[PDB]
Amino acid sequence: LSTATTLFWRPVPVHVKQQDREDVLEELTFRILTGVAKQNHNLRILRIHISSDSDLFFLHTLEVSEEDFQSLKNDEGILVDFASFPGKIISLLEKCILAQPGDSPRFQAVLTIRGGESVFKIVEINDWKQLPHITLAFRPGN
């Protein structure tokens, strides 16, 4: 990516779930970057990177190009354009940062890891269901 601008770079409380392992609430670092892909006729790229200060090998990355976003928009029922999408993600992440144990409904950030792949979601838990506000697939590494 060229002229890659970081829009968001903060720790986020995440419920890290994994096969055969205990769920753990960890402060993970999220970096959200936007840029244009020189090598791909200046396609705009949205990049989200998850890392852990305490584990150099804990790496998860999502890259959504403008063309990827057309499919994502349909599957997730997203109603805004590509340029407005990062800001909506940021607002959801803030709800997770600010969420308290007591309030209801409650916003949680969840990262389920499984076999060289993982699924990040932000859910709203009310009295009778877990409402996913966003669901994103991440790949291992940078």
Add this chain to the structure above:
Amino acid sequence: LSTATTLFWRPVPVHVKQQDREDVLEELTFRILTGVAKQNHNLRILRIHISSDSDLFFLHTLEVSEEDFQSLKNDEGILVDFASFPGKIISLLEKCILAQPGDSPRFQAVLTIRGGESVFKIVEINDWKQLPHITLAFRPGN
């Protein structure tokens, strides 16, 4: 259904989506029943029927057995048992009934017809996303 109890039987505002046609806000009649099917090992069944008082043939039907609910519960992240499920659906339908065009967020009933059959859902629409509280597939007719 023999010992069948009707829990709900009234008009509800619904947004109908057809392939080669325009979206339309119609008053559709919803009937929700619970009972047992002698035809199916006396399993407990939830039956939902959609109709129209202006079109004799506009008919859509869903039947969910207590066995089917196990897979549905996981796909929809439902946190209550089968017995409590219809009440939550009814609660969602009431919100669609009481909703107003200028609300934010807005609860909205949607019936998408495709290839004959249809997909019904109740969404919570905010500034950027359709939050599906429930999604259900219906069959044409009674």
